[PDB]
Amino acid sequence: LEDVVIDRNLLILGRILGEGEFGSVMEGNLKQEDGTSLKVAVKTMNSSQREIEEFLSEAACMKDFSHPNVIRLLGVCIEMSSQGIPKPMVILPFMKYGDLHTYLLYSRLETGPRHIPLQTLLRFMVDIALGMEYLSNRNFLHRDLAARNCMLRDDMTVCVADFPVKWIAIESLADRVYTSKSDVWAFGVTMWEIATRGMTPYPGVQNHEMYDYLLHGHRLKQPEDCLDELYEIMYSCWRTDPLDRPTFSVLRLQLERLLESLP
Numbered sequence: 674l675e676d677v678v679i680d681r682n683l684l685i686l687g688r689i690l691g692e693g694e695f696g697s698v699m700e701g702n703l704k705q706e707d708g709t710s711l712k713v714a715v716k717t718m719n720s721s722q723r724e725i726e727e728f729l730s731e732a733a734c735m736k737d738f739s740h741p742n743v744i745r746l747l748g749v750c751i752e753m754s755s756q757g758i759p760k761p762m763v764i765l766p767f768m769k770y771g772d773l774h775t776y777l778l779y780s781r782l783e784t785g786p787r788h789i790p791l792q793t794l795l796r797f798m799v800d801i802a803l804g805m806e807y808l809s810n811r812n813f814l815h816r817d818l819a820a821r822n823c824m825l826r827d828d829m830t831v832c833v834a835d836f837p838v839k840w841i842a843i844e845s846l847a848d849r850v851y852t853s854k855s856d857v858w859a860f861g862v863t864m865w866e867i868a869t870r871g872m873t874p875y876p877g878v879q880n881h882e883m884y885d886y887l888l889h890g891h892r893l894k895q896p897e898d899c900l901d902e903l904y905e906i907m908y909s910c911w912r913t914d915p916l917d918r919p920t921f922s923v924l925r926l927q928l929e930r931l932l933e934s935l936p
């Protein structure tokens with residue numbers, strides 16, 4: 674696990690981009706092998722070796738993945754400054770359009786991007802499935818899929834990243850069992866988020882009420898002018914039993930099929 678480490682001296686920090694988990698997300702430049710520097714994103718933190726490990730364990734696993742619709746890892750870095758304290762860093766690639774959730778809301782404004790049509794909205798769904806199909810076929814659970822954690826690439830392509838009660842599958846709220854079908858649930862609500870153009874899920878119902886809300890058979894409503902075929906797709910990701918839920922490998926094609934049927 675030494676191919677992924679990059680010397681700190683090859684990196685400079687910039688402005689704070691957002692606030693992520695137990696750390697800060699800032700901008701910076703990374704000197705590459707070929708001279709050129711690159712705009713990147715860095716996740717900075719300590720709780721003994723218990724927050725260091727859980728932070729550098731996503732990195733050690735996420736690292737050797739390859740997919741266009743899954744965010745890639747450019748390197749991890751270790752600061753060790755001032756008081757005799759090591760602090761770690763995760764070089765992530767820069768996205769000049771932020772995450773999909775925020776970009777969805779901006780579309781609603783004049784200064785924001787244009788009214789996003791269905792094909793573009795449906796396209797984003799195809800991208801997330803592709804990446805979620807990838808991590809599925811190689812036995813990785815995301816455990817936190819949401820348009821908040823789906824950045825937008827400059828080619829208007831979506832990628833999955835940042836490895837929330839309204840997004841937990843019903844069985845995972847109880848049996849503490851997160852599986853690849855618990856992801857299928859989350860991808861269904863993320864499909865709702867996108868169709869609404871940024872609405873907080875389950876309006877009216879509150880976070881604690883959610884378990885009883887699901888155990889009685891209440892799922893998300895069909896949004897305004899969301900197609901029938903599209904809602905029955907995201908509804909199918911929600912069936913009470915995990916094994917009756919379709920998979921990422923099937924969701925993608927039905928989505929890819931639906932997009933073609935439009936002008």
Ligand SMILES: CCCCNc1ncc(C(=O)NC2CCN(CCCF)CC2)c(N[C@H]2CC[C@H](O)CC2)n1
Pocket residue numbers: 690691692693698714765766767768769770771772821824834835
């Ligand atoms: C954390 C996993 C991905 C990290 N890569 C990454 N790249 C880019 C950004 C980013 O903010 N780009 C902004 C700057 C460009 N836009 C302004 C245009 C006009 F100036 C707005 C968005 C980013 N912000 C994270 C920060 C943590 C948050 O929780 C998710 C998003 N993160």
